[PDB]
């Protein structure tokens with residue numbers, strides 16, 4: 441019942457698996473881990489419940505994909521063979537949006553850690569969003585998100601919703617930051633090594 445701990449435990453397993461040469465990452469286990477992140481977006485206010493749904497929709501596709509597909513590589517190789525990589529709703533396309541979700545949380549976590557003593561979430565939330573999603577979300581979406589900033593809870597309140605004190609929240613947020621880093625790099629390299637790009 442400790443959402444940050446579930447997140448930290450799940451991504452630590454992925455970081456371990458992935459710090460192997462030639463890793464075999466199960467879609468099942470990957471999408472499960474990703475869904476553990478979902479509630480964080482809920483904790484960022486009622487406007488951002490919509491950001492949660494947008495994230496949850498992508499993760500849910502990875503979940504359905506995992507019923508008939510073993511690894512993230514196999515998933516991308518299928519889409520590559522059907523030439524449907526960037527088609528709206530393809531597993532690989534959703535995979536890329538989900539990777540950004542993870543990065544989003546990671547940078548948010550960094551920004552929150554680097555802004556201790558500030559009880560407001562506005563600066564960490566806008567900086568992390570500008571960095572991760574500004575190059576990809578259109579003007580329309582970004583305007584909405586910018587409006588969403590006005591419903592942000594306090595820092596202390598967020599922590600209360602995650603049921604952590606300052607010290608514990610810091611350890612589990614830092615853990616996710618540590619674990620998610622090589623995973624994101626691994627996911628980026630999956631797209632780069634197949635010349636798909638990460639910008640679409």
Ligand SMILES: CCCCCCCCCCCCC/C=C/[C@@H](O)[C@H](COP(=O)(O)O)NC(=O)CCCCCCCCCCC
Nearest residue numbers: 484487488490491494495537541565569581584585587588
């Ligand atoms: C007046 C009420 C206030 C409304 C304010 C609206 C709140 C912002 C809602 C943000 C949802 C935008 C998610 C973007 C959806 C799609 O454009 C993309 C591409 O999907 P595709 O075209 O392949 O179907 N979806 C994503 O990139 C999923 C990313 C989900 C996580 C991003 C939100 C995180 C924002 C954090 C802000 C603290």
